[PDB]
Design a protein around this ligand. Structure first.
Ligand code: CLA
Ligand code: CLA
Ligand code: CLA
Ligand code: CLA
Ligand code: CLA
Ligand code: CLA
Ligand code: CLA
Ligand code: CLA
Ligand SMILES: CC1=C(/C=C/C(C)=C/C=C\C(C)=C/C=C/C=C(C)/C=C/C=C(C)/C=C/C2=C(C)CCCC2(C)C)C(C)(C)CCC1
Ligand SMILES: CC1=C(C/C=C(\C)CCC[C@H](C)CCC[C@@H](C)CCCC(C)C)C(=O)c2ccccc2C1=O
Ligand code: SF4
Ligand code: SF4
Ligand code: SF4
Lengths: 151, 62, 42, 80, 69, 154, 732, 30
């Protein structure tokens, strides 16, 4: 993510001159295709038949629709695509482990070591140990969510 | 004479307090500061309630 | 029946129930004198 | 380094202050309540605003809190 | 006390450090924090049996004067 | 007629932006107008409205530029009531709920032992516990200012 | 175990990151800091509160010095009005060659900032347009910079020491100290706004130099003395007289009847030269009210213990407060932000409502700039102004040096102010806000016809009597022949009418409907950004939850599970919450204004009037519209000159935002985690021989609410900040 | 001779604070 940021600092400040977009931090052909595409030689041989390219969304340029307006077509990716993504690619990291941190320690936490002594929810505990709160998984869950929503 | 009557609470210690009636029981055991055993039907952040009392207090009416 | 009385209550949906089966009436009245805009005395 | 100030009456327990984590608990014998018992801390140096010390500990007005100012690797807890 | 949900009993600890020594309540005498028995000291509580609590201005730059109690 | 704000009858805006605002829902010829539901986007409704057009009229509110009701009572001319003639009732409509509100409670220490004796409502209401609500003030509102308050009670 | 840093053992021996928070944070906390005699802090502040007087003075000796370099005044003299008011010169080695296409603006030659500090008029007014006759205010606010740090260096020396007594003395630091502080200050000022400004407004290189051989008034210095004056008000500078120029330049000096003339568009010069030369005597009586030595003039004291009236054939009996306001400093930071509270807000329109210089009423960029600002301190001074208002309570007040008199009483009957400042709001809760919503229902459900917009009937009275003659309502005074506007029908009361209403006047603005829909809303805000305060302050004396925060203090970080019935509990962290609802209550009254005002500067005043009385109006076309010039000076082509907030804004729109983790994400989730890897990097070789000087911990829960506050607000001071400016350099 | 005052900015941002986070690195080890 610390990466759209740059290309803002590099579109405002950052002069198309040189930065992270398609005719930019390009990445010429590209990004492929991947595969998908192959998903489009997939029915003409290779898994002998079936018909028409397993789902128009992937493939080459073998292209349809109907009803005046469009339907599905070769939705081609690239920059804008190994971008973003690596955010769902991110997020569903620091959205788990929140989760795992608070799923493992949860009953034995390396820092109130004995939990089963407050319940499932259980608020926090010490104003001592200089700031023990949001310890419960119940509250590891109380923000377990927020991010999902964010994700 | 007043054993557990409609008697008051009055010291810069309490929770309930002005809140009136009730001295339920009173002991005869001298040491402490806590002779005056109170129980009403209204409560602090416990549930059992009733905590004990005495001395610079009962400044009350009937 | 009685007597004021008292009489007998019920549980959690009474303050609620009040919203519906009676309070609606409102929308009848608010229909009856379509909108209000301001004071119609009689 | 434990704070601020915390106050009389309870003990015995069997229904109050039986659960500091980091000790900080004797019980002298002393004369006043309905058999003999006055307390805070034969200590306070192992604790730790383990402030579960009144939750178990009634007796009226503020009754446990923290104030660590210095705040110490003894009871700021962080070993490693 | 972990050793309280299988039945079990008599925990003891110690210290232990560079270079060994203390640091322990069971047993130094195992006085069970609960009990109460021998000679256990003062350090037991404000001349304020609390209620009397207020603005506490017995302070303006106390020295010697309280640091503390 | 005061501050502006004209009584509507010179029509300039309101009446027209009206016979505009409502009247392209009316161009709902864009469907088929005979009997419907499915459609009546055209013909009716305007009955409440346009067949209440020059109707609303009619007491002015001195609806104003924009051409819409700038609704005001403050205690001048006829208005001393566009919210006050319907301004008292509310006062009235509320705090005698206070009576039920009070005497409901002020029963919840009588017959003795209370609270959820608040959840089970002892169907608390229908008459004098409410049906005093009718008659409280200036005849007895100073249920306040003697033996009930003070307060004076026990 | 760790000896450093200083002030106390406590946290200076302490071994975690805290120190550095709890050094830096609590670093002007000295008044409870184990190292301080009855002087020490009283001693302290002095030098201290010179000290900055230093930089305030190097705040500007620069930025004065700064301009004439930079910008183009000595240039801009030739023609005075477009413009892109010019700030600094921006050495930003990241900016793409389109630095041309960047900020090659105004007089530039470099990507310069668009100045909005107003000032550029506040300097044009006093005197100068010759920057070769600047170079000097620089050198002057240096002639004050070094000079006054001897008040630093020196009067921070036991020798030419201070005392403490000297500090508690009341009737000298005050009485005597109105007379000097303000008083004289004006005169010469009051006179410079008289004898060096006039002669250019007449047009004349008066300078200093030729400093007596002027005589800008013909009849010397006579009638001042004597007892005859009106050969002064004599022929005001006149009617067209292109400003500070030739023709119509009607000599006079000390005037006081005319006001504006369209051209300056701004309170005309040396007719506030009589203003500053009057206020004076209104302390120079009440200014020799008391003392120095001499046995004549005031004590105060029975001012009270007698003068507790208004009060007492019962009541309250003051028998002196005093040994409280004079002993308790706080008060001196109880009411010196408290009341330099108000001023901020009564400067927050006087300053605009009628300007004061070289054209601003029709700049619509100060207003924009130089307003909200002067408002946000009427926040950030007005707020945190009762804070030093709990304080004395749990940290100056003794219930016994006082419990005769009002305060302690105020107190005895305090759980009342609380709960009528409350009913003051739950109501200013449903209403001003219930109504308000079909004013958002209908307006949606094709039904604006019917609508609850009840038009303000009251402010209404004012703004007419105080002159304003704009339609309807056959009453007296402003009759433009009326008997409050008579007996005085000439004094003060043609001119302040001559401009009273057509808006390039903004004077007493054009009252719309729903005008109170915010106005009300703004008499919601307050009543609910007090109570916080007047708890976070008042009962925050003790409470009954923990009837001893009295001991505890003002700034204790939350509480912990303590009998499930405790948490965030600092009287501080009620100032916290208090600073939320206040930025809410500014949250609002800067929408209005921008909506409003904005309206005008492009004629369209259905930018309200039509709209607001149903908030998408706000959202749609206060909020949604106008924009994407700003947020399209970024816009996958280029940047042009509105590039920044297009960055700054999303800044405010980030730097806001993450004042959130700290906030929603409380405390003992950080340590626990920041252990489970404060640890990982303690194992992993190569970067093993690295044991770190102190030892990484998470953050006191207070903090973890503070830097929630200075990422936030900083964010929030930001954007609107950049928007209110962005906006207008496109549209006006 | 001439061209500058950049002299300042590579300081005020580049070395100056490079020396702030340098000598109060500290405050601690001041
Ligand atoms: C508890 C209160 C305290 C008090 C006494 C005030 C008082 C004031 N604040 Mg204020 N304020 C406070 C706390 C307080 N504030 C806090 C905590 C905040 C933080 C949010 C603010 C934030 C704030 C802002 C942003 C502003 C103010 C402003 C004002 C002034 C507006 C003028 C006015 O009252 O219009 C109406 C007042 C009337 C008296 C007219 C109505 C008459 C009624 C009451 C009739 C009934 C009585 C009788 C017939 C009239 C006699 C009274 C007479 C004066 C007419 C006023 C001096 C404004 C300001 O400073 O001026 C530009 C504004 O800028 N305040
Ligand atoms: C402190 C106050 C005041 C303020 C807020 C500023 C602010 C600024 N000055 Mg500046 N300046 C001032 C007084 C001020 N100046 C005075 C009194 C002088 C002359 C004695 C200057 C001479 C000056 C020059 C030559 C330049 C700046 C520049 C700047 C900009 C960046 C310079 C920098 O990095 O550090 C400013 C630090 C100092 C003035 C003190 C230096 C010693 C430090 C390290 C301690 C910045 C907007 C630069 C600029 O804007 O780029 C085009 C550059 O051109 N100033
Ligand atoms: C007008 C305003 C304000 C008010 C209400 C007062 C009122 C008073 N001043 Mg006063 N004073 C003031 C401003 C004020 N002062 C200022 C600004 C100064 C300049 C420093 C003084 C300097 C001053 C001096 C030197 C004295 C007073 C005195 C007095 C008292 C004299 C008796 C009198 O004048 O009335 C008559 C009362 C009647 C009931 C008529 C019978 C009276 C209480 C005298 C005093 O009483 O004690 C200090 C006298 O000592 N004043
Ligand atoms: C944390 C900070 C330290 C600093 C950096 C400051 C800084 C300041 N204080 Mg200050 N002050 C402090 C501690 C500090 N104070 C303490 C500990 C107290 C006692 C609690 C005060 C009580 C105090 C008062 C009464 C005032 C200031 C004022 C001021 C401002 C200077 C006004 C001036 O020079 O002439 C102006 C001189 C007078 C108004 C007399 C200045 C910004 C003044 C202010 O608020 O400015 C707006 C003034 O009100 N202070
Ligand atoms: C505990 C509460 C209390 C407090 C602290 C305040 C405080 C305030 N009220 Mg207020 N008010 C109260 C009860 C209170 N009110 C009640 C019960 C009423 C109903 C009569 C009002 C009706 C009222 C009005 C009409 C106004 C205020 C205004 C104000 C503000 C300015 C006061 C002033 O300068 O006039 C002296 C100030 C914030 C005024 C304002 O908005 O200016 C900021 C004005 O609007 N009040
Ligand atoms: C975005 C909206 C939202 C809404 C609809 C409210 C609504 C309310 N807040 Mg509020 N508040 C908000 C966001 C909001 N707040 C935010 C973001 C904060 C900062 C985190 C606060 C901090 C705050 C405080 C400190 C208080 C309120 C109080 C109130 C109540 C005032 C009385 C009333 O209006 O009758 C309905 C009201 C219900 C006050 C209250 O409850 O006093 C009676 C007061 O305690 N609020
Ligand atoms: C130009 C000068 C001077 C003069 C001649 C007046 C004259 C007047 N002012 Mg006024 N005023 C002035 C300066 C002056 N003011 C200043 C400087 C201020 C600001 C402090 C004010 C603030 C002010 C206010 C708030 C009010 C007035 C009002 C009035 C009128 C009284 C209305 C009435 O009821 O009749 C009575 C006439 C008498 C002579 C009083 C009766 C006493 C007899 C029996 C002797 C009157 C025409 C009042 C008004 O406009 O209408 C209600 C309103 O109260 N003035
Ligand atoms: C999806 C979310 C989102 C969020 C969380 C925010 C949040 C915010 N916006 Mg905002 N905004 C948004 C979408 C959002 N905006 C969109 C889609 C637009 C249209 C382009 C805007 C246009 C906008 C403007 C013009 C302003 C804000 C401002 C603000 C801030 C003031 C709010 C406040 O303190 O509450 C209390 C109310 C706040 C941080 C204001 C600001 O800059 O000051 C911080 C400013 O007025 N926003
Ligand atoms: C005469 C007058 C007036 C008035 C004014 C004011 C504002 C004043 C103050 C006054 C006062 C001195 C006041 C006080 C009051 C009190 C009160 C008190 C109110 C009320 C109330 C309440 C709160 C109520 C309650 C209740 C009741 C009683 C009934 C119903 C139900 C209930 C129970 C809820 C006017 C306007 C005409 C003007 C001129 C003069
Ligand atoms: C992120 C976070 C942390 C962790 C804090 C961390 C990991 C801080 C690590 C330091 C960061 C990396 C510094 C970045 C910015 C600072 C250097 C700025 C201050 C510098 C000047 C004063 C010198 C908490 O401990 C916490 C506690 C309670 C509620 C919320 C939170 C919380 O949200
Ligand atoms: S703290 Fe607990 S054990 Fe000690 S006296 Fe109080 S209630 Fe008894
Ligand atoms: S802070 Fe509380 S829980 Fe911790 S040792 Fe001390 S009394 Fe016990
Ligand atoms: S801030 Fe933390 S320690 Fe304090 S009560 Fe809340 S959850 Fe517990």
């Amino acid at each position: 993510f610390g990466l759209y940021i740059h290309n803002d600092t590099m579109s405002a400040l950052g002069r198309p001159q040189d930065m992270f977009s398609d005719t930019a931090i390009q990445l010429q052909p590209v990004f492929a295709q991947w595969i998908q595409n192959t998903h489009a030689l997939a029915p003409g041989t290779t898994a002998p038949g079936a018909t028409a390219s397993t789902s128009l969304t992937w493939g080459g340029g073998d292209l349809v629709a109907v009803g005046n307006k469009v339907a599905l077509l070769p939705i081609p990716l690239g920059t804008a695509d190994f971008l973003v993504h690596h955010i769902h690619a991110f997020t569903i990291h620091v959205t788990v482990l929140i989760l795992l941190k608070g799923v493992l320690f949860a009953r034995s936490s390396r820092l109130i070591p004995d939990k089963a002594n407050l319940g499932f929810r259980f608020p926090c505990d010490g104003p001592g140990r200089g700031g023990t709160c949001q310890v419960s998984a119940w509250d590891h869950v109380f923000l377990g969510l927020f991010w999902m929503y964010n994700s | 004479p007043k054993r557990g009557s409609k008697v008051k609470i009055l010291r810069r210690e309490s929770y309930w307090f002005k809140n009136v009636g009730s001295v339920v029981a009173v002991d005869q055991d001298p040491k402490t500061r806590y002779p005056v055993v109170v129980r009403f039907a209204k409560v602090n952040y416990a549930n059992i309630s009733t905590n004990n009392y005495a001395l610079d207090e009962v400044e009350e009416v009937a | 029946m009685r007597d004021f009385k008292t009489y007998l209550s019920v549980a959690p949906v009474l303050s609620t129930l009040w919203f519906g089966s009676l309070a609606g009436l409102l929308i009848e009245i608010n229909r009856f004198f379509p909108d209000a805009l301001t004071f119609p005395f009689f | 380094s434990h704070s601020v100030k915390i106050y009389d009456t309870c003990i015995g327990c069997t229904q109050c202050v039986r659960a500091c984590p980091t000790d900080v608990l004797e019980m002298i014998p002393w004369g006043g309540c309905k058999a003999k018992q006055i307390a805070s801390a034969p200590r306070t140096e192992d604790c730790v605003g383990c402030k579960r010390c009144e939750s178990a500990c009634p007796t009226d007005f503020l009754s446990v809190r923290v104030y660590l100012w210095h705040e110490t690797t003894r009871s700021m807890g962080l070993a490693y | 006390t972990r050793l309280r949900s299988k039945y079990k009993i008599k925990y003891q600890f110690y210290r232990v450090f560079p270079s060994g020594e203390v640091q322990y309540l069971h047993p130094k005498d195992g006085v069970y924090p609960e009990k109460v028995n021998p000679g256990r000291q003062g350090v037991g509580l404000n001349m304020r049996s609390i209620g009397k609590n207020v603005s506490p201005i017995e302070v303006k730059f106390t020295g010697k004067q309280p640091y503390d109690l | 007629d005061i501050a502006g704000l004209t009584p509507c009858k010179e029509s300039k805006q309101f009446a027209k932006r009206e016979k505009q605002a409502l009247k392209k829902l009316q161009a709902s010829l864009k469907l088929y107008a005979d009997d419907s539901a499915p459609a009546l986007a055209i013909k009716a409704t305007m009955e409440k409205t346009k067949k209440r057009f020059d109707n609303y009229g009619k007491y002015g509110l001195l609806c104003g530029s924009d051409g819409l009701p700038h609704l005001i009572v403050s205690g001048d001319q006829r208005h001393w009531g566009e919210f006050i003639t319907p301004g008292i009732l509310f006062l009235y409509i509320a705090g005698w709920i206070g009576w039920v509100g009070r005497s409901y409670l002020i029963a919840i220490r009588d017959e003795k032992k209370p609270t959820q004796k608040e959840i089970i409502i002892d169907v608390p209401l229908a008459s004098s516990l409410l049906f005093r609500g009718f008659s409280w003030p200036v005849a007895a509102y100073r249920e306040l200012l003697n033996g009930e308050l003070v307060d004076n009670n026990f | 175990a760790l000896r450093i840093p200083r002030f106390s053992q406590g946290i200076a021996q302490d071994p975690t990151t805290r120190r550095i928070w709890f050094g830096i944070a609590t670093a002007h906390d000295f008044e409870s800091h184990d190292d301080i005699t009855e002087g020490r802090l009283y001693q302290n502040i002095f030098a201290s509160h010179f000290g900055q007087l230093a930089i305030i003075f190097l705040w500007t000796s620069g930025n004065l010095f700064h301009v004439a370099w930079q910008g183009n005044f000595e240039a801009w003299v030739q023609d005075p009005f477009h413009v892109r008011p010019i700030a600094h010169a921006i050495w930003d080695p990241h900016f793409g060659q389109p630095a041309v296409e960047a900020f090659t603006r105004g007089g530039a030659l470099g990507p310069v900032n668009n100045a909005y500090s107003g000032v550029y008029q506040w300097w044009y007014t006093i005197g100068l347009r010759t920057n070769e006759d600047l170079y000097t205010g620089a050198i002057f606010l240096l002639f004050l910079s070094a000079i006054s740090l001897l008040a630093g260096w020196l009067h921070l020396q036991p020798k030419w020491k201070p005392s403490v007594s000297w500090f508690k003395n009341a009737e000298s630091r005050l009485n005597h100290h109105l007379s000097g502080l303000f008083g004289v200050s004006s005169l010469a000022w009051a006179g410079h706004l008289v004898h060096v400004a006039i002669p250019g407004s007449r047009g004349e290189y008066v300078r200093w130099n030729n400093f007596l051989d002027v005589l800008p008034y013909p009849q010397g210095l006579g009638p001042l003395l004597t007892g005859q004056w009106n050969l002064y008000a004599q022929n005001p500078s006149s009617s067209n007289h292109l400003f500070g120029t030739t023709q119509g330049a009607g000599t006079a000096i000390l005037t006081i009847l005319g006001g504006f003339h369209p051209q300056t568009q701004s309170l005309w010069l040396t007719d506030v030269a009589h203003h500053h030369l009057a206020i004076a005597f209104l302390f120079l009586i009440g200014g020799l009210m008391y003392r120095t030595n001499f046995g004549i003039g005031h004590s105060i004291k029975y001012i009270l213990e007698a003068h507790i009236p208004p009060g007492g054939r019962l009541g309250r009996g003051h028998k002196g407060l005093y040994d409280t306001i004079n002993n308790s400093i706080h008060f001196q930071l109880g009411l010196a932000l408290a009341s330099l509270g108000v001023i901020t807000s009564l400067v927050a329109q006087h300053m605009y409502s009628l300007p004061a210089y070289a054209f601003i009423a029709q700049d619509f960029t100060t207003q924009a700039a130089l307003y909200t600002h002067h408002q946000y301190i009427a926040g950030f001074i007005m707020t945190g102004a009762f804070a030093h208002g709990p304080i004395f309570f749990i940290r100056d007040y003794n219930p016994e040096q006082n419990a005769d008199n009002v305060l302690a009483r105020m107190l005895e009957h305090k759980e009342a102010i609380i709960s009528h400042l409350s009913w003051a709001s739950l109501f200013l809760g449903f209403h001003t806000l219930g109504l308000y919503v079909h004013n958002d229902v209908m307006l949606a459900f094709g039904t604006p016809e019917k609508q609850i917009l009840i038009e303000p009937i009251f402010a209404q009275w004012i703004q007419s009597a105080h002159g304003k003659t704009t339609y309807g309502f056959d009453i007296p005074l402003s009759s433009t022949n009326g008997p409050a506007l008579n007996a005085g029908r000439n004094i003060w009361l043609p001119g302040w009418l001559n401009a009273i209403n057509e808006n390039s006047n903004s004077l007493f603005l054009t009252i719309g409907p729903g005008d109170f829909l915010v106005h009300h809303a703004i008499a919601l805000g307050l009543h609910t950004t007090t109570l916080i305060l007047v708890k976070g302050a008042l009962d925050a004396r003790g409470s009954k939850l923990m009837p001893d925060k009295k001991d505890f203090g003002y700034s204790f970080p939350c509480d912990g599970p303590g009998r499930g019935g405790t948490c965030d509990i600092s009287a501080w962290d009620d100032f916290y919450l208090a600073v939320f609802w206040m930025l809410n209550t500014i949250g609002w009254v800067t929408f209005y204004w921008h909506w409003k005002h904005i309206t005008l500067w492009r004629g369209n005043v259905s930018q309200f009037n039509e709209s607001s009385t149903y908030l998408m109006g706000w959202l749609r076309d206060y909020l949604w519209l106008n924009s994407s010039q700003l947020i399209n000076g970024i816009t996958p082509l280029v940047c042009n000159s509105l590039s920044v907030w297009a960055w700054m804004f999303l800044f405010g729109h980030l730097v806001w935002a993450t004042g959130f983790m700290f906030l929603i994400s409380w405390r003992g989730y950080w340590q626990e985690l920041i252990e489970t890897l404060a640890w990982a990097h303690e194992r992993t070789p190569l970067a093993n021989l690295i044991r770190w000087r102190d030892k990484p911990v998470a953050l006191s829960i207070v903090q973890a609410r503070l830097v929630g506050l200075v990422h936030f607000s900083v964010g929030y001071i930001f954007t609107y900040a950049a928007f209110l400016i962005a906006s207008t350099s496109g549209k006006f | 001779m001439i061209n500058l005052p950049s002299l300042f900015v590579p300081l005020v941002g580049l070395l100056f604070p490079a020396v702030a986070m340098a000598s109060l690195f500290l405050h601690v080890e001041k």
